[PDB]
Design a protein around this ligand. Structure first.
Ligand SMILES: [Mg+2]
Length: 261
């Protein structure tokens, strides 16, 4: 429905950057969250969807920052936030995530903003690490008009997300001792029976295995961008990339359902 950029390849999705040049700015007066950096394409040649990304407990934008330029360069507006407190819980993280999306939607209609007219505010996604990944799934449960979710090493006090109808990719980290796969990511994935979903576990990964500076950005970036293109943009050129077992020796557990190639 909303295809931008050239036909993808493994090589184009695994590279450092997509086709679009990326700029960023710090939000001046963050509305309902602590701080925010907005990454955006200067030359997408069409409006793009928006993605809000939340860190884990104690953590800040640095932890998840790499996703900003990576996603934006493929044709998205990305906001990475600091929460009002580093010690905010998942419900609060979800509220702040949606507040960041709301503010991006607002700045799209503000003529002084660098993202004036760049955003399709009907096409939105959510991402985050740990309690911020838990917050993303809460966002998805409460706001089913969201187009995609792709949390990493998610954690929540409940693993029951059976109501989620949003297409959800879960990144997991095999050797996570904070949000162990067996007791967090996997039961969350298994709870969801009404959506397109995927589970991708990185071999030997600590809890930070999908964070800034990780050594698997080729694969994790490929998958995050493909999921977002396929579901935020309804771009079926990405159906294989989004839905396929990537056949990587860095993946120690792969599962997917309701995800057509
Ligand atoms: Mg956490």
């Amino acid at each position: 429905s909303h295809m931008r950029g050239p036909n993808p390849t493994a090589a184009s999705l695994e590279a450092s950057a997509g086709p679009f040049t990326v700029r960023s700015f710090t939000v001046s007066r963050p509305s309902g969250y602590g701080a925010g950096t907005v990454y955006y394409p200067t030359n997408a040649g069409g409006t793009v969807g928006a993605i809000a990304i939340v860190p884990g407990y104690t953590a800040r934008q640095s932890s998840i920052k790499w996703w900003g330029p990576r996603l934006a360069s493929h044709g998205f507006v990305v906001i990475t936030i600091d929460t009002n407190s580093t010690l905010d819980q998942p419900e609060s993280r979800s509220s702040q995530q949606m507040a960041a999306l709301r503010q991006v939607a607002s700045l799209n209609g503000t003529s002084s903003s660098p993202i004036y007219g760049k955003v399709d505010t009907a096409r939105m996604g959510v991402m985050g690490w740990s309690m911020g990944g838990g917050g993303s799934l809460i966002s998805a449960a409460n706001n089913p008009s969201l187009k995609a979710a792709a949390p990493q090493a998610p954690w929540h006090s409940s693993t029951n997300f059976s109501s989620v109808t949003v297409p959800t990719l879960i990144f997991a980290c095999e050797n996570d001792s904070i949000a162990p796969v067996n007791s967090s990511a996997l039961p969350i994935y298994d709870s969801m029976s009404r959506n397109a979903k995927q589970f991708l576990e990185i071999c030997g990964g600590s809890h930070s295995c999908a964070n800034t500076g990780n050594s698997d950005q080729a694969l994790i970036g490929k998958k995050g961008v493909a999921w977002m293109k396929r579901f935020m943009d309804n771009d079926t050129r990405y159906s294989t990339f989004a839905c396929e077992n990537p056949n990587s020796t860095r993946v120690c557990d792969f599962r997917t359902a309701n995800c057509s190639l």
